[PDB]
Scaffold this active site. Structure first.
Site, short mmCIF file in Angstrom:
data_model
loop_
_atom_site.label_atom_id
_atom_site.label_comp_id
_atom_site.label_asym_id
_atom_site.label_seq_id
_atom_site.Cartn_x
_atom_site.Cartn_y
_atom_site.Cartn_z
N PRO A 198 -7.34 0.05 11.30
CA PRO A 198 -8.78 -0.21 11.28
C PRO A 198 -9.18 -1.17 10.17
O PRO A 198 -8.48 -1.37 9.18
CB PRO A 198 -9.37 1.18 11.04
CG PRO A 198 -8.33 1.86 10.23
CD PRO A 198 -7.02 1.41 10.84
N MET A 199 -10.35 -1.77 10.37
CA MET A 199 -10.99 -2.58 9.34
C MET A 199 -11.53 -1.68 8.24
O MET A 199 -12.09 -0.61 8.51
CB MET A 199 -12.13 -3.39 9.95
CG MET A 199 -11.76 -4.79 10.39
SD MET A 199 -13.23 -5.77 10.75
CE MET A 199 -14.27 -5.37 9.35
N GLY A 200 -11.37 -2.11 6.99
CA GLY A 200 -11.89 -1.30 5.89
C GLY A 200 -11.27 0.07 5.82
O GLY A 200 -11.95 1.05 5.49
N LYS A 244 0.28 0.03 4.96
CA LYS A 244 0.73 0.57 3.69
C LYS A 244 -0.13 1.75 3.27
O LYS A 244 -1.22 1.98 3.80
CB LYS A 244 0.70 -0.49 2.57
CG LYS A 244 -0.66 -1.17 2.34
CD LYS A 244 -1.66 -0.32 1.51
CE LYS A 244 -2.95 -1.14 1.25
NZ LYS A 244 -4.07 -0.38 0.61
N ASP A 300 -2.99 -7.71 -1.28
CA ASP A 300 -1.71 -7.08 -0.99
C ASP A 300 -0.79 -7.88 -0.07
O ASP A 300 0.27 -7.37 0.31
CB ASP A 300 -1.93 -5.68 -0.40
CG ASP A 300 -2.88 -4.83 -1.24
OD1 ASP A 300 -2.87 -5.01 -2.49
OD2 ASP A 300 -3.60 -3.99 -0.68
N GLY A 357 -8.21 0.87 4.12
CA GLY A 357 -7.30 1.13 3.02
C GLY A 357 -5.83 1.15 3.41
O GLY A 357 -4.99 1.51 2.58
N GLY A 374 -4.39 -1.68 4.57
CA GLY A 374 -3.91 -3.04 4.37
C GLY A 374 -3.67 -3.81 5.65
O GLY A 374 -2.84 -4.73 5.65
N1 LIG Z 1 -6.66 -9.53 11.53
C1 LIG Z 1 -7.46 -8.66 10.68
N2 LIG Z 1 -7.20 -7.36 10.63
C2 LIG Z 1 -7.91 -6.55 9.86
N3 LIG Z 1 -8.90 -7.02 9.12
C3 LIG Z 1 -9.22 -8.32 9.11
C4 LIG Z 1 -8.50 -9.19 9.90
N4 LIG Z 1 -9.01 -10.42 9.73
C5 LIG Z 1 -10.02 -10.33 8.86
N5 LIG Z 1 -10.16 -9.07 8.48
C6 LIG Z 1 -11.14 -8.64 7.56
O1 LIG Z 1 -10.52 -8.53 6.02
C7 LIG Z 1 -10.17 -7.29 5.82
C8 LIG Z 1 -8.65 -7.13 6.05
O2 LIG Z 1 -8.01 -7.05 4.77
P1 LIG Z 1 -7.04 -5.72 4.42
O3 LIG Z 1 -5.80 -6.14 3.68
O4 LIG Z 1 -6.63 -5.03 5.71
O5 LIG Z 1 -7.89 -4.64 3.50
P2 LIG Z 1 -8.33 -3.12 4.03
O6 LIG Z 1 -7.51 -2.07 3.32
O7 LIG Z 1 -8.02 -2.94 5.50
N6 LIG Z 1 -10.02 -2.96 3.78
P3 LIG Z 1 -10.88 -3.89 2.62
O8 LIG Z 1 -9.92 -4.58 1.67
O9 LIG Z 1 -11.77 -2.95 1.83
O10 LIG Z 1 -11.77 -4.93 3.29
C9 LIG Z 1 -10.99 -6.41 6.89
O11 LIG Z 1 -11.93 -5.71 6.28
C10 LIG Z 1 -11.61 -7.42 7.88
O12 LIG Z 1 -13.08 -7.41 7.71
#
Ligand SMILES: Nc1ncnc2c1ncn2[C@@H]1O[C@H](COP(=O)(O)OP(=O)(O)NP(=O)(O)O)[C@@H](O)[C@H]1O
Ligand SMILES: Nc1ncnc2c1ncn2[C@@H]1O[C@H](COP(=O)(O)OP(=O)(O)NP(=O)(O)O)[C@@H](O)[C@H]1O
Lengths: 281, 278
Positions: free
Chosen positions: A100-102, A11, A142, A104, A106
């Site tokens: 990617p992780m972190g 997203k 989300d 934004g 989702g």
């Molecule tokens: N299968 C996965 N994919 C991505 N992230 C994961 C997963 N499992 C656990 N995580 C962790 O939880 C977060 C994933 O939540 P997400 O909805 O993708 O928010 P984001 O926009 O990617 N970043 P943030 O919310 O700041 O942590 C990542 O930061 C990972 O450390």
């Protein structure tokens, strides 16, 4: 058993406003989501021996901490407690991970949503979309948007979703190189926390912006660099709490042309916005 | 009616079941009200003006949950054509509950304002709607809005009525203010207590997952609990700093209260499963 393939789209927050903070530290948000025709692909093979295995661990995330596994375990708990989980229900899950992780984008919440929807379908639990969205909110902020599968305006504590039809534009999404976990931004004392609550019509007529962007820009030189680059070509903004930034284009050709201007250290992709999630089929 | 109650709550137990990527914690927790709290004076106005006449020490008036609750109700009602032209109010509070103590005083104030103004103005919002609005103001607002002792799950919106024994409590405020985010950021906080059924939870020993962290990090909480534990089952409420001790009679609670150091600033109050607000 059968090998099933399931989309997990990214997203963008087309805008993101922080209207307040509760005493427990939770921030109330007003934000508009659109999906991208781009993201992860999950392979789910159901099992009858009750085992739940992640076949492709995600580097930087222990197994039982993966939102894939947390989502499966939560569905198993909720379905079992309501006599809707067959004995021996299990799954082998692998993921082709692009988001990617972190970032934004989702990715984690999208993975959770897809796992909830896919395992509910495959195991035959019979949970409604409402019930899966209620479970999903416990897993990620989300998850409900991805479960319900429509571009949407989100307020309340993330459970009030209203469908919106934003232009399905072409986006260039850049990863500026750093990972910014949301708590790093949400704990910042300089974060804006008093943006006025506005109706959806008023928001659709506002200058779209992301209240996290000034903070991310100032704290992370990489985000400032990526934004400074894209802003030479198109309206560009942070998504989520970063680190990812995006630029809007009217055509695929224009987006890919600007992607070609990207410094080699700025990884990016081009994807179209879609208002209906691929997961909904 | 211009005088409205705002009762305290106790978390009779509190379990932390998970943490999302954005930092938010999911809980399983049991709420009971106390027959003790604040009293609000809410005087309707017809000029569309909204004013807090009595400031709460340390709280900017626009950040006061009383004002935030009134302005949220005005917005939600107006957007659904349920706010009579000129709706306003002058609000005062006689605040007897402490802040940052885990008695939910701020959330209770918000709940009382939502219910009171909805009634006085005649907006006609349902209890479900007010509880949904309340979640934006404070984590515990929905329990105070619905008005029943309850088991709270989900992100705080899944409420199941429960009827815990209506005991007498000695509530102690060890003076130190522990804002919830201070506890919720602690790396040692338990964040993976298993989710369990209400029937299961009602038959295990009640505990508060925040207690051990609060005791280790704050000597006033450690000393406040060590004293009460001599006499009765005692636990942290909320994220602290308040602690409570459980008695079966008012006299027993009060006799322990009279042995309390002056720095405890304790009170005795009975648990009630029906909010005075309702
Ligand atoms: N299968 C996965 N994919 C991505 N992230 C994961 C997963 N499992 C656990 N995580 C962790 O939880 C977060 C994933 O939540 P997400 O909805 O993708 O928010 P984001 O926009 O990617 N970043 P943030 O919310 O700041 O942590 C990542 O930061 C990972 O450390
Ligand atoms: N009318 C109010 N009464 C009490 N506190 C208020 C009020 N308005 C704003 N606040 C502030 O917001 C918080 C109110 O939340 P509250 O319901 O008291 O939670 P608590 O269980 O007592 N512990 P905590 O979450 O740390 O505040 C207080 O800390 C105040 O600083």
């Amino acid at each position: 058993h059968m090998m099933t393939r399931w989309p997990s789209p990214a997203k963008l927050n087309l805008f993101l406003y922080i209207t307040g903070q509760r005493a427990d530290g939770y921030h109330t948000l007003q934000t508009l989501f659109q999906f991208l025709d781009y993201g992860d692909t999950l392979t789910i093979e159901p099992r009858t021996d009750g085992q739940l295995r992640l076949l492709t661990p995600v580097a930087g995330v222990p197994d039982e901490e993966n939102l894939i596994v947390r989502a499966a375990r939560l569905l198993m708990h909720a379905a079992s407690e309501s006599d809707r989980l067959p004995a021996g229900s299990g799954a082998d899950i692998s993921i082709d991970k692009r988001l990617p992780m972190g970032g934004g984008l989702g990715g984690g919440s999208s993975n959770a949503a897809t796992v909830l929807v896919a395992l509910n379908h495959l195991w035959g639990c019979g949970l409604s979309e409402d019930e899966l969205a209620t479970l999903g909110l416990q897993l990620g902020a989300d998850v409900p948007v991805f479960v319900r599968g429509h571009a949407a305006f989100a307020e309340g504590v993330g459970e009030i979703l209203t469908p919106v039809e934003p232009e399905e534009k072409w986006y260039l999404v850049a990863h500026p190189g750093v990972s910014i976990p949301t708590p790093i931004i949400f704990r910042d004392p300089e974060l804006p926390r008093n943006t006025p609550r506005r109706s959806i019509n008023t928001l659709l007529n506002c200058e779209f912006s992301n209240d996290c962007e000034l903070i991310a820009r100032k704290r992370f030189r990489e985000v400032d660099a990526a934004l400074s680059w894209l802003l030479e070509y198109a309206p560009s903004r942070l998504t989520g709490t970063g680190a990812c930034v995006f630029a809007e284009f009217n055509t695929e050709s224009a987006a890919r042309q600007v992607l070609d201007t990207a410094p080699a250290w700025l990884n990016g992709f081009v994807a179209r916005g879609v208002n209906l999630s691929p997961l909904k089929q």
